[PDB]
Design a protein around this ligand. Structure first.
Ligand SMILES: *[C@@H]1O[C@H](CO)[C@@H](O[C@@H]2O[C@H](CO)[C@@H](O)[C@H](O)[C@H]2NC(C)=O)[C@H](O)[C@H]1NC(C)=O
Ligand SMILES: *[C@@H]1O[C@H](CO)[C@@H](O[C@@H]2O[C@H](CO)[C@@H](O)[C@H](O)[C@H]2NC(C)=O)[C@H](O)[C@H]1NC(C)=O
Ligand code: CU
Ligand code: CU
Ligand code: CU
Ligand code: CU
Ligand code: NA
Length: 499
């Protein structure tokens, strides 16, 4: 069952064996992935998070981010540790109480402390639309049509060297899959469909690092949503999905009753499908209970290309139709050396006092804010352009902005910008050497918003900056509850920190 929009959520330690290998984890709701949190557009969510963690090897503090939800007027509920809150300590709870006006789509939730989400705290978050403009394109849309793609590690995250090329041990589809080495025939996930029906498949990357080449043998996929943004229909036979992205696609169950492989090939880790790695099963009702015998093509003839996507609504692009044609045009210098990433010459290291609390305490320019050099102010009610030229080691890097979605004016692997009708989204691959992926948005949401690579190992190694959007209006726009004001005193007392 789905939970929410008003619910408790307990965060616990437990042993799990999703690929046949047992290890301890950090779990929401006792499962990997965690339960789906759901509601309708405009609902009030109140997710009371109970931190019941006791194993220090995965950290006993926690904080949860609601990925892709704008948090307008509720910046304090966004979740990134040391940007919008101090962590919740063990034995305590915290009500993330916010609203979702003007958003409907496929999202997710995850720990936003260190690399803790890699240790298991990740799950889907769906905001349904009772008047969805795409409703007539499918018959079924429910918890059974969510498809999660996850990397899974046998080594615990706090034992992964910082800045290293860290590689997974299994791909998990809906929480199950097989290990790349010492492979055992452990159970594969089954997605069941009825011949003749059409399904809204909600594809969620909960990855900490790899991108996946996702396909379904014998089937094609008609994209209708990108990171929460309704799209024109685009039919493809393969989707390359980067960490933290989401797509909805229509699956037409129009092939002969049978069993078909679902494939998710990561860019690192095990290559291919030997022993049923990187795989799950699409089973039609009435098919024999047996593994598929289907083949992938040698090449995919209609792969997703990001410039082919266009919004369903007339969203346009803010600003003027040329590079630098914005009120505040920025170009970030994105670099890596010696195990650490940097943005504009500064490697991100979380501050002792969360950025939001520094601003509420009266620091009101970005040079007054800590970490020094890691906070850029943005002016209010202005068009912002951010160019993100690639080249830093460890690519392709999927950059994500909190508090906002954005027009993708230039995409990976294509030098031509689009100032007319590009897709809007919240996480974007910045591509390869010589690319100049560029995003635009307007500043109508006061508060400190994280911008970072969503490869969690890279964030840990410093690949982040904070956009302090409309510092002067942050306090009036974001009144804070007492329980939020209590978090930093409690955290600092528990950890013997003076501030
Ligand atoms: C990516 O595009 C940005 C503009 O959006 C380019 O920025 C210019 O960079 C040159 C120096 O390289 C400066 O003289 C200009 O002031 C910048 N802004 C402009 C022209 O609007 C950036 O060079 C591009 N990067 C790559 C690798 O193509
Ligand atoms: C590279 O990106 C550009 C810009 O998004 C794409 O150009 C558009 O192509 C569409 C489809 O043919 C035309 O309707 C638009 O007028 C083009 N816009 C511009 C500004 O040129 C282009 O198709 C992409 N290249 C590839 C190989 O997909
Ligand atoms: Cu996220
Ligand atoms: Cu986010
Ligand atoms: Cu990265
Ligand atoms: Cu983040
Ligand atoms: Na415009």
């Amino acid at each position: 069952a789905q939970i929410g929009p008003v619910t408790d959520l307990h965060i616990t330690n437990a042993n799990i064996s999703p690929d046949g290998f047992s290890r301890p984890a950090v779990l929401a709701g006792g499962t990997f992935p965690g339960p789906t949190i759901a509601g309708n557009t405009g609902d009030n969510f109140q997710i009371t998070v109970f931190n019941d963690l006791t194993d220090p090897s995965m950290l006993t503090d926690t904080s949860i981010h609601w990925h892709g939800l704008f948090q307008k007027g509720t910046n304090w509920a966004d979740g990134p540790a040391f940007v919008t809150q101090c962590p919740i300590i063990t034995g305590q709870s915290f009500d993330y109480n916010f609203n979702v006006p003007g958003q409907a789509g496929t999202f997710w939730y995850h720990s936003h402390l260190s690399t803790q989400y890699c240790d298991g705290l990740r799950g889907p978050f769906v905001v349904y639309d009772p008047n969805d403009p795409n409703a007539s394109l499918y018959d079924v849309d429910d918890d059974t049509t969510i498809i999660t793609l996850a990397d899974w590690y046998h080594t615990l995250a706090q034992q992964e060297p910082i800045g290293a090329a860290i590689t997974a041990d299994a791909t998990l589809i809906n929480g199950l899959g097989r290990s790349f080495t010492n492979t055992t025939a452990s159970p594969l996930s089954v997605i069941t469909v009825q011949s003749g029906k059409r399904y809204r498949m909600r594809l969620v990357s909960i990855s900490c690092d790899p991108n996946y080449l996702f396909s379904i043998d014998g089937h094609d996929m008609t994209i209708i949503e990108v990171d929460g943004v309704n799209s024109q229909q685009l039919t493809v036979d393969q989707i390359q999905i980067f960490a933290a992205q989401r797509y909805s696609f229509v699956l037409n169950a129009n092939q002969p009753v049978g069993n078909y492989w679902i494939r998710a090939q990561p860019n690192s880790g095990g290559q291919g499908f030997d022993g049923g790695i990187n795989s799950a099963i699409l089973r039609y009702e009435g098919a024999t209970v047996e593994d598929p015998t289907t083949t992938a093509p040698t090449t995919f003839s209609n792969p997703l290309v990001e410039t082919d996507l266009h919004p369903l609504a007339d969203l346009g692009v803010p600003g003027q139709p040329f590079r630098g044609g914005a009120d505040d045009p920025l170009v970030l210098n994105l670099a890596f050396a010696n195990g650490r990433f940097s943005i504009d010459g500064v490697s991100f290291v979380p501050p002792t006092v969360p950025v939001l609390l520094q601003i509420l305490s009266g620091a009101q320019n970005a040079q007054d804010l800590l970490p020094a050099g890691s906070v850029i102010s943005l002016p209010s009610n202005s068009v912002i352009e951010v160019a993100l030229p690639a080249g830093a080691a460890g690519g392709p890097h999927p950059f994500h902005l909190h508090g906002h979605n954005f027009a993708v004016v230039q995409s990976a692997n294509n030098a031509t910008p689009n100032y007319v009708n590009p897709i809007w989204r919240d996480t974007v691959s910045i591509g390869g050497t010589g690319d100049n992926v560029t995003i635009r948005f307007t500043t109508n949401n006061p508060g400190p918003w994280f911008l970072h690579c969503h490869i969690d190992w890279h964030l840990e190694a410093g690949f982040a900056i904070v956009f302090a959007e409309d510092i002067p209006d942050t306090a009036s726009a974001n009144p804070v509850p007492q329980a939020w004001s209590d978090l930093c005193p409690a955290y600092d007392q528990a950890h013997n920190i003076s501030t």
